[PDB]
Amino acid sequence: MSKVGINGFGRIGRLVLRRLLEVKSNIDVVAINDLTSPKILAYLLKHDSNYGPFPWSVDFTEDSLIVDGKSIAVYAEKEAKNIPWKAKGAEIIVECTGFYTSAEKSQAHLDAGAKKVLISAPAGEMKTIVYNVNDDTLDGNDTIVSVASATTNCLAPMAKALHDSFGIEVGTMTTIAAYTGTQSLVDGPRGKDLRASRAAAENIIPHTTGAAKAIGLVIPELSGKLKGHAQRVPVKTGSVTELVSILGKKVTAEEVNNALKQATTNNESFGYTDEEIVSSDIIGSHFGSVFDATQTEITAVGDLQLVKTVAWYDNEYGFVTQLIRTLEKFAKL
Amino acid sequence: SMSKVGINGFGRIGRLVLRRLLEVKSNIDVVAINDLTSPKILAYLLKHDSNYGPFPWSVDFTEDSLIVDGKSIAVYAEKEAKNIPWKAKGAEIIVECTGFYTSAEKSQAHLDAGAKKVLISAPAGEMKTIVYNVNDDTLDGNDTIVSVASATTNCLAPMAKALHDSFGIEVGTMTTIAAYTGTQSLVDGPRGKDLRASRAAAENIIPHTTGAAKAIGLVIPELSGKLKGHAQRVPVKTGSVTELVSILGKKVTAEEVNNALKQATTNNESFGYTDEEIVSSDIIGSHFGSVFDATQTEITAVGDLQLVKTVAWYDNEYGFVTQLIRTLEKFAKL
Amino acid sequence: HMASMSKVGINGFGRIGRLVLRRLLEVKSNIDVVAINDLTSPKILAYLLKHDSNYGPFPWSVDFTEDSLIVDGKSIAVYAEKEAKNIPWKAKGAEIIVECTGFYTSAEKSQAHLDAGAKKVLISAPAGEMKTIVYNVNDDTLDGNDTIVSVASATTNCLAPMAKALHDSFGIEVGTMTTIAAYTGTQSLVDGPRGKDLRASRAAAENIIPHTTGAAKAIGLVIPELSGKLKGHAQRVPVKTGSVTELVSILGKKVTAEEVNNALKQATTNNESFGYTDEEIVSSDIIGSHFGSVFDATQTEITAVGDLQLVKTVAWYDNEYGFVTQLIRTLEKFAKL
Amino acid sequence: MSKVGINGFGRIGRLVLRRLLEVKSNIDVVAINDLTSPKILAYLLKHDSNYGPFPWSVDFTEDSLIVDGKSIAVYAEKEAKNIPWKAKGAEIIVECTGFYTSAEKSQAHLDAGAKKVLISAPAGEMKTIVYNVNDDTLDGNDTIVSVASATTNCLAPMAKALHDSFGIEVGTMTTIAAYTGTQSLVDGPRGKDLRASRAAAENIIPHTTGAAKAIGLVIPELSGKLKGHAQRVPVKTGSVTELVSILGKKVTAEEVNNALKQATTNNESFGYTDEEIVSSDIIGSHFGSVFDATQTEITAVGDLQLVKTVAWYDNEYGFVTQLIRTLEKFAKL
Ligand SMILES: NC(=O)c1ccc[n+]([C@@H]2O[C@H](COP(=O)([O-])OP(=O)(O)OC[C@H]3O[C@@H](n4cnc5c(N)ncnc54)[C@H](O)[C@@H]3O)[C@@H](O)[C@H]2O)c1
Ligand SMILES: NC(=O)c1ccc[n+]([C@@H]2O[C@H](COP(=O)([O-])OP(=O)(O)OC[C@H]3O[C@@H](n4cnc5c(N)ncnc54)[C@H](O)[C@@H]3O)[C@@H](O)[C@H]2O)c1
Ligand SMILES: NC(=O)c1ccc[n+]([C@@H]2O[C@H](COP(=O)([O-])OP(=O)(O)OC[C@H]3O[C@@H](n4cnc5c(N)ncnc54)[C@H](O)[C@@H]3O)[C@@H](O)[C@H]2O)c1
Ligand SMILES: NC(=O)c1ccc[n+]([C@@H]2O[C@H](COP(=O)([O-])OP(=O)(O)OC[C@H]3O[C@@H](n4cnc5c(N)ncnc54)[C@H](O)[C@@H]3O)[C@@H](O)[C@H]2O)c1
Ligand SMILES: [Cl-]
Numbered sequence A, D: 001m002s003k004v005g006i007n008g009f010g011r012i013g014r015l016v017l018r019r020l021l022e023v024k025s026n027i028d029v030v031a032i033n034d035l036t037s038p039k040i041l042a043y044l045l046k047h048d049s050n051y052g053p054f055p056w057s058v059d060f061t062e063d064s065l066i067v068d069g070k071s072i073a074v075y076a077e078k079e080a081k082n083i084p085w086k087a088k089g090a091e092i093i094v095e096c097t098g099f100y101t102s103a104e105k106s107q108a109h110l111d112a113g114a115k116k117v118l119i120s121a122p123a124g125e126m127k128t129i130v131y132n133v134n135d136d137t138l139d140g141n142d143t144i145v146s147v148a149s150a151t152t153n154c155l156a157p158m159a160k161a162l163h164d165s166f167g168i169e170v171g172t173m174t175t176i177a178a179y180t181g182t183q184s185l186v187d188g189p190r191g192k193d194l195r196a197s198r199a200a201a202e203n204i205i206p207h208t209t210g211a212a213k214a215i216g217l218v219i220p221e222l223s224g225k226l227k228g229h230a231q232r233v234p235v236k237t238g239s240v241t242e243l244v245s246i247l248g249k250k251v252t253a254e255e256v257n258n259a260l261k262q263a264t265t266n267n268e269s270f271g272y273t274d275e276e277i278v279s280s281d282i283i284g285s286h287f288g289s290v291f292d293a294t295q296t297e298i299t300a301v302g303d304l305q306l307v308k309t310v311a312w313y314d315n316e317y318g319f320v321t322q323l324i325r326t327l328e329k330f331a332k333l
Numbered sequence B: 001s002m003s004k005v006g007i008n009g010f011g012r013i014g015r016l017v018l019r020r021l022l023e024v025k026s027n028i029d030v031v032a033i034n035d036l037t038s039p040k041i042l043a044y045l046l047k048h049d050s051n052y053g054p055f056p057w058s059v060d061f062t063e064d065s066l067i068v069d070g071k072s073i074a075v076y077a078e079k080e081a082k083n084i085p086w087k088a089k090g091a092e093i094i095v096e097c098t099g100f101y102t103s104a105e106k107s108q109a110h111l112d113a114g115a116k117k118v119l120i121s122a123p124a125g126e127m128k129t130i131v132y133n134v135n136d137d138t139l140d141g142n143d144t145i146v147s148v149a150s151a152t153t154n155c156l157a158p159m160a161k162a163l164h165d166s167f168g169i170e171v172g173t174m175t176t177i178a179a180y181t182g183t184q185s186l187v188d189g190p191r192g193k194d195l196r197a198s199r200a201a202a203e204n205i206i207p208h209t210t211g212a213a214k215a216i217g218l219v220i221p222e223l224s225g226k227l228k229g230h231a232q233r234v235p236v237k238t239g240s241v242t243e244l245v246s247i248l249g250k251k252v253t254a255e256e257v258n259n260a261l262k263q264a265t266t267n268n269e270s271f272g273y274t275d276e277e278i279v280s281s282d283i284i285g286s287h288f289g290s291v292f293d294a295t296q297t298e299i300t301a302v303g304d305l306q307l308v309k310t311v312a313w314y315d316n317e318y319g320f321v322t323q324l325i326r327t328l329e330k331f332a333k334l
Numbered sequence C: 001h002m003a004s005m006s007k008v009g010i011n012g013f014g015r016i017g018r019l020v021l022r023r024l025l026e027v028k029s030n031i032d033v034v035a036i037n038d039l040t041s042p043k044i045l046a047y048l049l050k051h052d053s054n055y056g057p058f059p060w061s062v063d064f065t066e067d068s069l070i071v072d073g074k075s076i077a078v079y080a081e082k083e084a085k086n087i088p089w090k091a092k093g094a095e096i097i098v099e100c101t102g103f104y105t106s107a108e109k110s111q112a113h114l115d116a117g118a119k120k121v122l123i124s125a126p127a128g129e130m131k132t133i134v135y136n137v138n139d140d141t142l143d144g145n146d147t148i149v150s151v152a153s154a155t156t157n158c159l160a161p162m163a164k165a166l167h168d169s170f171g172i173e174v175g176t177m178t179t180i181a182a183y184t185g186t187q188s189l190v191d192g193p194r195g196k197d198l199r200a201s202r203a204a205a206e207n208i209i210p211h212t213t214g215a216a217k218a219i220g221l222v223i224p225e226l227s228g229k230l231k232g233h234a235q236r237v238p239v240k241t242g243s244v245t246e247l248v249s250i251l252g253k254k255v256t257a258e259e260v261n262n263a264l265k266q267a268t269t270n271n272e273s274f275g276y277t278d279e280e281i282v283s284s285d286i287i288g289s290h291f292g293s294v295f296d297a298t299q300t301e302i303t304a305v306g307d308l309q310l311v312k313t314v315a316w317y318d319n320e321y322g323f324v325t326q327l328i329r330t331l332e333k334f335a336k337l
């Protein structure tokens, strides 16, 4: 299988390699570009605060990591057009920096000699894939594709199942989510977002997300029908997404749960639980989303009905399992 | 009028009841406390507070009392309310904060033990349940035992009242993203029969059932049975937020919803307004029961369908207590 | 070969009790857990066993009935007796009790399990002056006549291997210890009474909390030559698990940091209980450790003015799982004596 | 001199202003240099996650803050030598960025028109002041001074009291300390320090500190006699320092506690407690250091004795009170 380069060896970038080795993928990771020395990247890869020790050996040289006995080139080019992707033949770039989230920006990797780029974040109006929701839309002509956010990978499977079974007329989502590197440790400036400047592990922090707003890139029939936001909270990873919908049909909780159970069957992207789990129980999940039947709520007065559905997600590893599913298919095309 | 209070349960709420009475220089005096522990320990906890810092007045103790700002408070340690000697120091109104007497029948014990009225710091079934500046006009001179519901109820009710008066609420569901509390667990282990309550609270997002929405009809009778809800408990020590998703009886804009709220909060000592980009730690110490945040208002419309999301902050300890005390000061004078 | 004892009961299916079962299964021990006594329903114990905040999903299947757990297909009886003397351990023939409640920390208290039909008891905590074992430090003192034994605290299992190595190589004349340690269920979630100790009443995930420990004071039970030569305490802090112990010593010899690190390295060679690191690790890196203690050469410090010298040595420990590994090593040996 | 500028309006820089206003200082803060807009600085000054709402009014303009009705110029120069300090006549700079911690570096403020610099951090071999320990060494001719670290301000009054009473012959320190902005929110590169790269609110993290090694600048007789380090842990502010010493005389715990009690009497910088406090009770302290008699420990075998003494410190607000005490004195010489 294809050779891969990772741009941005951060939380997502590191976990991309972790998961590729875990599934014994035929993808060959040949190069990493970041901003730092191999010594520091080796340290971060070996020791992880959320997932514990790297399951394979890790060393470094002047200009590479040696991971499980295999060499991976390390570059330190702030501008992607300068990355020497041709030197080890990286053909598909997993773009994980947060700084090339558009077609025009990620073109820099094609200019630097890669064939294709898979962006680990929403990236505007480009093909945007949630594996096992719309990955059938990928074809052999696609060169730059997005996997949207972790929140999108949580929300889309639930929304798709509800829409297929009952119709969603309108809905709003809140995700109660783990804090991430976009936030701040101590109160201090963090770009232009005032809320992002506040100490993440000491606060409930409202936070804008486009997961609902841009859901039409993944599920066309739902364009413009959803809105939402996030409340970021002090858990290191592991998150939960609530959706409150008006559906096309009156339902019971059992009926909603059964429909979802059915959608999750033989679906390695979308899991089901009727156990009273909590966020730490999703840490390390191999699903993009886990529907939780225990939290389903129907509120009805006369002809009016509100349906609340909830799914968990490991915004780090869980999401990464989706990104890797997508990467495997994209590399085959 | 009545001017002497007894506190049953000198916990998070009990201690803050005393703090707040003193802060507002109430004419109501706490004359007795009933707990399970020694005055030495109660003194220690009153002086040193993890959420609110050092007590602003002097605190000392004897074998059977606290001495707060130089005034003597009796301390009893009776497992069973019916045995608390409330007449000894003349406690007329019991602020019942233990979680163990949340019914008319149960709290009757305080009256059997000599007090005249009981205000329960929690939901307590079908009795008069007051959210100050929503339905406190329902209290009369014949009431002896009343509830001030939960902190979540005090957050939800004012927001729900203002929306309902201006627009009508046809149906709604809430989720409160809430500070963990002493009903939860520090490390994973049994916590009665509730599975989720058994999990380490400072290391998890934990779904948690709450009756705030289900029982809203005690506070706002026209919303009776129209709302549902739950909580997600998260790792902050105090400071919480309630989101309500409603279908209203009129199409609206966010500007219009926020203006209606601004009007309802204006000169309203119980219900505040912000259009600043605040986070939970900025609500710690709030003197409101609920602070509407106009920055989080969202209207989702598709044709004739419309979902309105409104959001209010609450200091589930001190904020709520300010309400409890508003209610207490009025209840003392009927 | 005559059968060694192979059937275990766990009293207190708590943080430690659930990890005992976990580690026994993990290492494919020939010891079988046949019964558990706690104060709750199988339903709740099964939920807590399946879902762990610190170590994640249980790696084997878990189901339950009205009076048992079914774990990896094997039935384990569940009893609910608050008094140990009433536990019906004979029903499934539990021979060795792993006593993990915190309520029977003496020989007088734990011999109730013998009354209740067990043959031996291993206590997951200090339990007075009984035989107290830190594996790979003094487990050679265990013999066939020991009936009730302690493995001391997680802090003792961290401290002892370091103190043993230093004392063997250089001599410890006097020393004091501070452990910076994860919070535990003896502490409080919110500020409120917690028995008689004032500090234990404070919100554990929101404070640094000084905390008394006997690990140094009772070190003579494990290393007799240091009896009465050490004091110390803990500072409990807001991490869920994973802890570190610092020891400051006056030694019998002048040393360099390098000579200390090398002596410790040799003491950790061929030693499944005591590890060594020279990497810049932090506490989350010790979570799930299979050692009782990991000596961290990066934190060694020698302060020397003329003839006077103070030596600081630091070891990490996973107070939950790492300690549990030491308990299980001792249990396996106890069972075969 | 009564006109001050603040370089770096961070945790320390903002609390500098808060404390100045709280004590009604006659110091006039005329200018602030940062990198961010006044809008964002206003928001941060108004809402503090550790200390709650700012007690005075705060507005802004495109180039100023208006605090309690008074205008403060805001500049945005990333090089100190370009800061226009002469425009509003800022004479004393409180240097709070962490990037000018030497004489040669802070010289830039003087080239830029200031007359004195007070550095909020250790700054090498220059005049270094712990107030109520050695502020009587501050000289009319000093133009660049340091107030060392929060940890130095905790350690120094305790060490001085012990040393005057008993003699300290050698000693080592460990501070168990709240995390700060030099650490990381998520695992990721943080300069060259590997430990600084790890998620600060999810770990105990060993951290080097010069508080003991450079004690000689403050207490010259203890020069070269102390070493120490930190363990950084997940509390937002509020810290504790332990010192283990060999003293020149045999002592009891009562005797150590009495000597320290005396040292704290009528001492605005050094407090005493015999209550069973924990770290959150130090937050908002007006002392640089609070000796805790409850943790004193004497370990004795034959004629060998080790003495463990312990002091709390609000590494933010507490240290800042010391910085202000020193600034007030400095401004008047
Ligand atoms: N919860 C999550 O963490 C999560 C989930 C889904 C998607 N994402 C997305 O994945 C992307 C990265 O997220 P993350 O949490 O890993 O961030 P992170 O900060 O942990 O990692 C970013 C990495 O990129 C590096 N970097 C920054 N600029 C660079 C440049 N110009 N060239 C090369 N390297 C550069 C940094 O050194 C860092 O190592 C973002 O687009 C984010 O939205 C994150
Ligand atoms: N913490 C919050 O956010 C919050 C908000 C609103 C309402 N409440 C309600 O107020 C009440 C107390 O809550 P809290 O958080 O203060 O709890 P807490 O656990 O902090 O305090 C309860 C106190 O009562 C004592 N107690 C228990 N049983 C007793 C008895 N039989 N006699 C005397 N004392 C006894 C305990 O020793 C403790 O000091 C509950 O009904 C709760 O639902 C709590
Ligand atoms: N947590 C640690 O870091 C750690 C490390 C080493 C040793 N220990 C020790 O191990 C023991 C337990 O610690 P833990 O953290 O598991 O405590 P825990 O509170 O998690 O577990 C105790 C378990 O015992 C049960 N229990 C309590 N009283 C009982 C009784 N009378 N009969 C039956 N069951 C009862 C509880 O319901 C709970 O399930 C203690 O002695 C503790 O000192 C703890
Ligand atoms: N927080 C503590 O506990 C503490 C205690 C003792 C000493 N200190 C020291 O005080 C100093 C600052 O600490 P802090 O905790 O406030 O850090 P912080 O990161 O909160 O604040 C630094 C501020 O300086 C600004 N800044 C960065 N580079 C700049 C530049 N070149 N020009 C202008 N502004 C710039 C940042 O935007 C930020 O607003 C450091 O030297 C630190 O070691 C901190
Ligand atoms: Cl580029």
Ligand SMILES: [Cl-]
Binding pocket: A180, A181, A182
């Ligand atoms: Cl992100």
Ligand SMILES: [Cl-]
Binding pocket: A209, A210, A212, A213, A226, A227, A228, A229
């Ligand atoms: Cl939206």
Ligand SMILES: [Cl-]
Binding pocket: B181, B182, B183
């Ligand atoms: Cl509660």
Ligand SMILES: [Cl-]
Binding pocket: B210, B213, B214, B227, B228, B229, B230
């Ligand atoms: Cl409900």
Ligand SMILES: [Cl-]
Binding pocket: C083, C084, C085, C086, C112
């Ligand atoms: Cl017994």
Ligand SMILES: [Cl-]
Binding pocket: C184, C185, C186
């Ligand atoms: Cl314990």
Ligand SMILES: [Cl-]
Binding pocket: C213, C214, C216, C217, C230, C231, C232, C233
């Ligand atoms: Cl001791």
Ligand SMILES: [Cl-]
Binding pocket: D079, D080, D081, D082, D108
């Ligand atoms: Cl410069």
Ligand SMILES: [Cl-]
Binding pocket: D180, D181, D182
């Ligand atoms: Cl710092």
Ligand SMILES: [Cl-]
Binding pocket: D209, D210, D212, D213, D226, D227, D228, D229
């Ligand atoms: Cl040093």
